Amino acid sequence: GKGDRRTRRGKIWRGTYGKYRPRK
Amino acid sequence: ARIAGVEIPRNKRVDVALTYIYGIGKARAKEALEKTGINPATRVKDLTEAEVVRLREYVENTWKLEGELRAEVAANIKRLMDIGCYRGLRHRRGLPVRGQRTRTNARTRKGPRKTVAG
Amino acid sequence: ARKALIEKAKRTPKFKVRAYTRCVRCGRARSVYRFFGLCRICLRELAHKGQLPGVRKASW
Amino acid sequence: EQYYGTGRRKEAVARVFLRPGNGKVTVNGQDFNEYFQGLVRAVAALEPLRAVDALGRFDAYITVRGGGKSGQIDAIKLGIARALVQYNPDYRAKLKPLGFLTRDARVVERKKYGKHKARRAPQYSKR
Amino acid sequence: ARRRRAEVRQLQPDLVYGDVLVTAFINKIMRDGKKNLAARIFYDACKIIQEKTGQEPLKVFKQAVENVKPRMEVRSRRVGGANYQVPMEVSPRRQQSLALRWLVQAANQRPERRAAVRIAHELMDAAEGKGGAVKKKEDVERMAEANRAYAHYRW
Amino acid sequence: KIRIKLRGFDHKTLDASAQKIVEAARRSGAQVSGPIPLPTRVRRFTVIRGPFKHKDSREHFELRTHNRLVDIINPNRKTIEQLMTLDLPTGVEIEIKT
Amino acid sequence: PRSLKKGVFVDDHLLEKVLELNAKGEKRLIKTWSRRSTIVPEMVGHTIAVYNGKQHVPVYITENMVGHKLGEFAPTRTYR
Amino acid sequence: GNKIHPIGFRLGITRDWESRWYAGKKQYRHLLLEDQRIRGLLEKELYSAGLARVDIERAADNVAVTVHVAKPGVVIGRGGERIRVLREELAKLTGKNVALNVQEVQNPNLSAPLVAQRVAEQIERRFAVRRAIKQAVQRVMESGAKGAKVIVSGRIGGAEQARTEWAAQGRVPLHTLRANIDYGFALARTTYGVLGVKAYIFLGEV
RNA sequence: CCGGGCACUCUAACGGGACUGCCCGCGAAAGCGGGAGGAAGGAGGGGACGACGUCUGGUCAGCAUGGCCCUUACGGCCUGGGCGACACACGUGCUACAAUGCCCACUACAAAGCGAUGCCACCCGGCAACGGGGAGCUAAUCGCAAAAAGGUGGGCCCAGUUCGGAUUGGGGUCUGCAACCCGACCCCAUGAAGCCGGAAUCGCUAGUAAUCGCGGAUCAGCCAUGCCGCGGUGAAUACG
Ligand SMILES: [Mg+2]
Ligand SMILES: [Mg+2]
Ligand SMILES: [Mg+2]
Ligand SMILES: [Mg+2]
Ligand SMILES: [Mg+2]
Ligand SMILES: [Mg+2]
Ligand SMILES: [Mg+2]
Ligand SMILES: [Mg+2]
Ligand SMILES: [Mg+2]
Ligand SMILES: [Mg+2]
Ligand SMILES: [Mg+2]
Ligand SMILES: [Mg+2]
Ligand SMILES: [Mg+2]
Ligand SMILES: [Mg+2]
Ligand SMILES: [Mg+2]
Ligand SMILES: [Mg+2]
Ligand SMILES: [Mg+2]
Ligand SMILES: [Mg+2]
Ligand SMILES: [Zn+2]
Secondary structure (H helix, E strand, C coil): CCCCCCCHHHHHHCCCCECCECCC | CCCHHHCCCCCCEHHHHHCCCCCCCHHHHHHHHHHCCCCCCCEHHHCCHHHHHHHHHHHHCCCCCHHHHHHHHHHHHHHHHHCCCHHHHHHHHCCCCCCCCCCCCCHHHHCCCCCCCC | CCCCCCCCCCCCCCCHHHCCCCCCCCCCCCCECCCCCCEHHHHHHHHHHCCCCCCCECCC | CCEEECCECCCCEEEEEEEECCCCEEECCCEHHHHCCCCHHHHHHHCCHHHCCCCCCEEEEEEEECCCHHHHHHHHHHHHHHHHHHHCCCCHHHHCCCCCCCCCCCCCCCCCCCCCECCECCCCCCC | CCCCCCCCCCCCCCCCCCCHHHHHHHHHHCCCCCHHHHHHHHHHHHHHHHHCCCCCHHHHHHHHHHHHCCCEEEECCECCCCECCEEEECCHHHHHHHHHHHHHHHHCCCCCCCHHHHHHHHHHHHHHCCCHHHHHHHHHHHHCCCCHHHCCCCC | CCCEEEEECCCHHHHHHHHHHHHHHHCCCCCCCCCCCCCCECCEEECCCCCCCCCCCCCEEECCEECCCCCCCCCCCHHHHHCCCCCCCCCEEEEECC | CCCCCCCCCCCHHHHHHHHHHHHCCCCCCCCECCCCCECCCCCCCCEEEEECCCCEEEEECCHHHCCCEHHHHCCCCCCC | CCCCCCCCCCCCCCCCCCCCCCCCCCCHHHHHHHHHHHHHHHHCCCCCCCCCCECCCECCCCECCCEEECCHHHHHCCCCCHHHHHHHHHHHHCCCCCCCCEEECCCCCCCHHHHHHHHHHHHHHCCCHHHHHHHHHHHHHHCCCCEEEEEECCCHHHCCCCCCCCCEECCCCCCCCCCCEEEECCCCCCCCCCCCEEEEEECCCC
16 A cells, blocks of 8 residues: 555555656 | 476466565566576466476576575574674664654564553 | 744854754744745745745736 | 527636537537546536427537536536527527526535634644 | 534436435445446346346335335433433435445355345345345334333423 | 836735826827736645644735736827836836836 | 765874874774764774763774774663 | 734735835845845934834835824934935945935824824823823724724833723724724833734725 | 747637527426527536624634733743653544556656756766765756656566565764754664454545545654645446
């Protein structure tokens, strides 16, 4: 969930980007 | 399909299954099924002798898994603990190590609450 | 605002790191807005007067 | 030739351009059933037409902007009702008993201070 | 509601059946305000009461509710340190509220994994006259009766 | 052919000030693009009413920076004349770049 | 999960003071207030007295602690 | 304590700002600290003149500073004297060459800032608070005014126990955001402690 | 996109509009119930606004201020430590315990704000954080931005699990004179408790609650899950 550092949504919640949430 | 130091994933998808291996998880799963060109979705029971052999080959040679891996961590902690090192003490006293507040939520590193008379 | 601690005005601190806002009226080193060089309290005081141009009573 | 009506809701603006036809409804250069891709209530938007035997006598090009599909759905419903009355004024005469003409004023209540969400107030204790 | 007697908030008819009761039932299913997935679940449930029943879903639905409606219930009332379970009539308004609420409740206690199945099967067993929902209804009506003794505290 | 965005805090000491640049350039050049509004950029400050504790009262302060356009296409000497240095209000700042 | 991009850090006064002792062979006991400095092979064998905020503690450096910063061996607080 | 500053509460309408100049994100905080510095001088200088309001307009290196007073004579000086000595210290302050006009006040009894500034006066000389205020309110009520009301803080008379004196006459609606009430504060250093004066003067409604 | 045109949306300024004014019933009247017209109906919805006074309420560390006390020092500078300590106890919260769900992919609707050495398009290097290069904007004409939930498709198949992310090992990025004490961030590894919570107890009456994401102030960076604000979806119930 939002708590998962290494997952899509988690990245969103933590506001960041990365392998699990690319910029596009 | 006993892979890493005596593993045994089965009946579930290979990636998901590969997980049950110590030093392995989600990430390294694809890497192995990717490089070793095996469909990640096949049931470990539906694997091919030719594939299991291959899999094991990559996995067992490329990464430090199971027992050996632990040995490393163990010795790693005993290290910064053998040396004066602050983190050493924390590992010793038993309180958290990544600079967290202990006045409250530190149960995971501390254990059950040993309630005392106020 | 201990006077000696109005050494913020001292510009040259050694490292821009040690530079801090400070209210340019009371000395308040907290809730000190930028667009005014003021602290949350004066902003309130002056604003209530009119000395802060445009600054009106927000409502919606 | 053509008939217009506006319509808005929960902060959404729908442009309604009615034209006689076989009932070809578009929205932002998209099939109706395309924009509102399976949103159950979507149908609503056209309820005014189906409320006067229209739809199968009319056609409509629609521009929709601002908010979310649900509001837009209702925002549309309005214009299509206004234009429908703009087309023929004797329509409202029976289009109003369903208030298709009223512009739902219901809107997001401001977020007040000292309270988590306008109304939702923080919880307390030792009281 | 100390001022005046609250308004029975009027609901909009069902898009697919044009019924207000259905919406109500749909609303009880909806959680976190996700009316789509809510509306969905219900409809798939109606389609399932088809592949399994030669009767029209709405027919099933209506009859299911009618059975889960309690006509007597217990309500407390202090009278000397000891508050007695006073049995009294249940107004249609609540009679309906309680039924739908109970349906969705029982339905979600069910074992079938899929939401709509649980709801269809509950609606089904509902009209049948069995199932957890109708159960609660009965345990309740049993509470009244079991207290006729205190009936004189009508009010 | 004359971009001149009028920005001010008072929406009257502007609407009035732009009504000038328009007339004092209407009969001299073309006709101008009339006065154009442009969304305002509202600033906001939310402070706690009193000092120390009492963190649930606050009070809100804004500072809307209104906008305007004007824009005169086809300038004719006498136009830049009726303008030039014939400005008046004090609660305004102007940007020119025709 | 450490950090310090590219370019380890060590305070001058401490650094260009430690190696100054190597030139003279070897010294005995030092003492800095900059516990912020990283340890380096240049120190192996020395003994730096790190300040915890109240005292100067003798900290014998070894090859095994070459990455850690002096402070990690001069505990700030006093507990139970 | 409650009640919004009746000025800041009306700044919109029935009361204009005391600094009507538009700067911007980069300048504003600067052109702000300026006025202060100004009013600072204009404060601990023109006290004797009895400064009501002290506006300040700007147009880039062109500043207004229309100091309103009760005794303009004090601001001016003999001939055109003072209104230059200070017009001098001024540019030393704001390196932006600014004017220094002077307008007069029509009755220092309708000028809340003064009346309050006044009652505060008496309080320092040791007058009788209760009356001082009763008089003040009067001065104001006689010389026009649809309403008025003064208020002093506590320690009145030198009393170890702080109190708070009243006095108010004629409608002084603080809730009718349209009335228009000049309000003015005024401190009062004292042998034993500070006191505070407030004056409200209702004049004209619409 | 260009021409082109202000109709439409919008931007923002002034003004129109609702008064129980009209219709029937009750009434002495005020007003009450229903009805037409109407975008809106009786205070249309939400703000600003808090009387004489109370608690010897809070604040002398915002500031101002009477008295009191210290003046190689109760004043000043600095380096380092501390405010971040932990056997315990409580408040407010966050994330969860899952299938009305989680994951991946593709794909669709927002509002209000912010941006000079700042937002940083596009490009290339990197799994990535980030780095290198670099266009545009002083910003309704450029950027932060992707809204999320949703829709379509596929996966998971009821398991402490593809639920959940604590904790810990290792590697690395950026801000900063400097991240041991004591920053955030990325990637790999680890993968804890938790299966909906005793007594007791909090919020909310409508676009509210519940749920979903977005901006901002402070600010180098950040321990924000806090606060202030924005909009998407959108209920239940009130006899009394
Ligand atoms: Mg997960
Ligand atoms: Mg594993
Ligand atoms: Mg001081
Ligand atoms: Mg700082
Ligand atoms: Mg909301
Ligand atoms: Mg607070
Ligand atoms: Mg709070
Ligand atoms: Mg009022
Ligand atoms: Mg007290
Ligand atoms: Mg106290
Ligand atoms: Mg004092
Ligand atoms: Mg110090
Ligand atoms: Mg603290
Ligand atoms: Mg929290
Ligand atoms: Mg497990
Ligand atoms: Mg489970
Ligand atoms: Mg209420
Ligand atoms: Mg009620
Ligand atoms: Zn201040």
